[PDB]
Scaffold this active site. Structure first.
Site, PDB file in Angstrom:
ATOM      1  NE  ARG A  83       1.747  14.746  11.388  1.00 60.02           N
ATOM      2  CZ  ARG A  83       0.425  14.852  11.503  1.00 60.02           C
ATOM      3  NH1 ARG A  83      -0.371  14.251  10.622  1.00 60.02           N
ATOM      4  NH2 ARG A  83      -0.103  15.558  12.503  1.00 60.02           N
TER       5      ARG A  83
ATOM      6  CG  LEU B 237      -1.870  -1.157   1.441  1.00 61.15           C
ATOM      7  CD1 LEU B 237      -2.967  -0.736   2.400  1.00 61.15           C
ATOM      8  CD2 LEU B 237      -2.455  -1.644   0.133  1.00 61.15           C
TER       9      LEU B 237
END
Lengths: 390, 390, 390
Positions: free
Chosen positions: B18, B11
């Site tokens: 961030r 995935l």
């Protein structure tokens, strides 16, 4: 120092197979000395009556250095050879074979691969051993990873029952975190006797010196185990990971001592300082600096960053920046770097300057002489207050 | 390696917001490979039946590399695109849309940002999952700072009840230190079903793959949670602080392995070694050294200090000190540095010397040839045993 | 910031004898500022009504800088001299002698040697002190080694009884790990009174400011002790070991902040960044790099490894490798290093190149100009798109 007539056996006859090196383990170096040199230095400083290094594996490669070490420490150091490799017990036996069969003084046994062992630890071991009037006292400690070490077996009254070696340890014994340091103080008679009862039965068909503890426990004999809380002091080196771990720990202590004595060290983690190195008050050391061998730095200097100096003498108020140098001297208030290369025999006078991309070999450069940049100076003798380039 | 027909979903379709970078998170590099490359390498080495990377945010920037990686690993690697960004659950759905609706083998779900995940961890996860015949097994671990991670909810019998995401966690759940690693092994039928029951209700109006655990708990289904004690193995990268933390940890492991294999590394903390690098027995590496790319070092070398080598080949017994070099070769017993610069295409023969303030570009320098100092050598072909300067 | 009319006493009149330096302790530097400068900066930023630094030992050497600091912070900063060295209590007295005998606002007492003390800690101290309507509130914390610190004495109800100084501590009190930070907030009337009851009796025949707590406890007065969990915030510097420890901790925080703001720092442990330094998004910093003074780095740069830049301005997409430079500017997309030396007054245009073993002093080098290698450029003005060497 030692009470006397204390006799110390240093055991250095095993293969450090896990080093994965063609150089013998106890010869691997740390902070400017081999592990063996470290040990011999701490031991000598107590001045036992006798001092006996036991050789074995690769003994022809180690002996010379013991002799080097003896003459260096102004002391007689005996070498005992292990006939075959039948274990640490046997090894201690050869050691004793270097003493008079009527020798009475207590006997301290230690190894060649515990480079951080210091005077106080050894003095404590003797004092404890005499105090409790033990047959054997054994230095222990507690590690986060007891792997490889003999384990300390204690009943609920903390009385010591025995020491089980890693090879012969059960999966539950392996969980024990208190380890055998491998530093002993034996009453000699007790010792000789206990050795004569060793069984090659288990589990590397060797005679374990560690088996002596259970024997003496058994035969109604007094057995003490002194725990060293500062483990680094008594940790051993079996692989290069441990070597580096201990190196770093000893460096930590060297730098720290310099700091408390008045030296600013900006980044201790990256400042490497060998044990013979001297540094003067208010000197500043910037990151990525090594100070090696007999390097001396005066006071109010600025050294680094990224500076490597081996056996270099540096005066007061000198500046030594991004310099790679060896066997040279740099005068008071002199300026060196960045990017300066000093080859053996460079002697730069007070207030002299060696600037960037400058290399000096075998040359004397007088007081206040500048070599600004991009210049080689070999085998030369340059007078005072000159300029040079290129 | 994998049992088969194991199908692995990787995935990599979320924004690593961030990171604060214009480069996609899973592309950030570590020890000579991007996080994604790390993951794909460990996964490939187990050889699932299928391997399906799910892209999404910035997919046009990541796909190429997956293809690069497929041909590099001599394996077919499928890419599944996420239509909209409706969460990890949805993301797994797209992943499955790459499998036959009749696919039977178990399904391992993993992410692109856990660069230290290794073979054993993945093999353990499968074996556990098969052993306990679980519907889902989920890798967990405990961190000193669970921030950002899904939290593991366990009743007093350590039975797992659910996983609450950081966004949806209550202040008391936030105190939970056991985190969701984000590595799953699902029985496929169970999985597909559980996905069809996801609610975008809460709390980022997305479909949480983590919600699958509570669902399967609920619908009388077997739910196992395997705890990975070595956290680094399963830690994820969300910001550049974490990237550096993991980089350092992996370096620690790389260097340590070299040390146990016979390489002296004086200061591991400042010695950086990429994963493809090979180093020979008894070589010594001094502080401030990076060995990058496909750099090879023979045995008995001395490298550093302050040396940076990228894709450099170094023979046995060579000396490479304060050298900045790339795409070059250095012969047996050759001496290089200090302050030497090797540009791509430098090939220095055995026993050759390149001294201080020397730069070589695109040149062959024959055996035993010296270039003492302060000299540039470009696009040249210098015969054996010559001298050069300037 | 501060409520007002808050008056802050900064205590800097003791000898830092343990520094072992000829420079006054509070003047020792850290991350580009002296400890004193750090403190004054955090304090100023809250804007007390009054701000009063108490001098004493070596006051003629420190005063100038306070004045420098006042004009730098665009604020009036008073200096109070300690007549004799009769302790911290006396010292606070001199401090007050700088206030109107009718001054009403609360009084914060702090020292000059706690360089990490930040705004939030000080704001919390005031808010707590007002909240619990205390007579004195004292910041405490817990250390692994309380050595040198005043110890906090608490009865079983955690009510604070007193503070015992290291000199006057009993061997059992020495075991106490909760220390006195030395940051106070006093109600002024309460304070003045408590000072008038100090006894030079014990144990360094001085007037301990710490004795004020027991006094106020005693005379039915409200005494609060706020514990700072982040110790670094409130740790003091007594020796150079502590200085380095705190330096490293503050660096850790500076680098980390840059990382979260988008800067890749490969090895934080060896990347030193002064507090005024700015760095742009996606810039990469390699190991052994210091960025000092007012150095500015644009975005997408590559800096290091082994790079030292002091007050250097660097444009976007520049490359600065193994460079030692100060007071210079480097243009967008320019390439510098390896082994490059920039002396004050170097201004290198966008897309310019300064290669290996190049030194520039006091020169402007136009856009796209290359100086390939092994060349010195002094006091020069070189036009755009030229080539140079040697």
């Amino acid at each position: 120092t030692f009470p006397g007539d204390t006799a110390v056996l240093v055991l250095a006859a095993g293969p450090g197979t896990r080093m994965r090196s063609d150089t013998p383990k106890v010869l691997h170096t740390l902070a400017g000395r081999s592990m063996l040199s470290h040990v011999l230095h701490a031991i000598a400083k107590l001045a036992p009556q006798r001092l006996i290094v036991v050789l074995g594996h690769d003994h022809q490669r180690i002996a010379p250095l013991v002799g080097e070490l003896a003459d260096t420490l102004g002391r007689t150091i005996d070498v005992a050879l292990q006939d075959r490799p039948l274990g640490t017990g046997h090894a201690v036996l050869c050691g004793l074979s270097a003493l008079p069969d009527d020798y009475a003084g207590n006997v301290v046994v230690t190894s060649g691969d515990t480079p951080l062992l210091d005077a106080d630890t050894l003095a404590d071991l003797i004092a404890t051993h005499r105090a409790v009037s033990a047959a054997v006292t054994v230095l222990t400690t507690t590690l986060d990873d007891p792997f490889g070490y003999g384990r300390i077996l204690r009943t609920q009254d903390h009385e010591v029952m025995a020491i089980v070696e890693q090879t012969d340890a059960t999966p539950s014994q392996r969980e024990i975190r208190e380890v055998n340091a491998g530093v002993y103080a034996f009453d000699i008679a007790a010792l000789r006797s206990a050795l004569s009862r060793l069984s090659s039965n288990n589990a590397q068909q060797e005679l374990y010196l560690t088996d002596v503890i259970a024997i003496l426990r058994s035969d109604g004999q007094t057995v003490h185990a002194s725990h060293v809380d500062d483990s680094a002091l008594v940790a051993g080196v079996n692989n290069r990971v441990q070597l580096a771990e201990l190196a770093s720990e000893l460096n930590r202590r060297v730098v720290a001592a310099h700091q408390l004595a008045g030296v600013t060290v900006v980044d201790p983690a990256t400042t490497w300082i060998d044990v013979d190195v001297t540094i003067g008050r208010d000197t500043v050391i910037h990151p990525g600096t090594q100070l090696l061998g007999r390097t001396q730095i005066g006071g109010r200097c600025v050294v680094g960053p990224d500076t490597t100096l081996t056996d270099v003498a540096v005066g007061d108020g000198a500046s030594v920046v991004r310099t790679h140098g060896s066997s040279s001297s740099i005068g008071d208030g002199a300026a060196v770097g960045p990017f300066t290369y000093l080859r053996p025999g460079t002697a730069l006078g007070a207030d002299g300057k060696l600037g960037a991309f400058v290399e000096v070999k075998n040359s004397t450069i007088g007081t206040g002489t500048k070599v600004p940049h991009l210049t080689y100076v070999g085998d030369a003798d340059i007078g005072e207050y000159s300029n040079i380039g290129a």
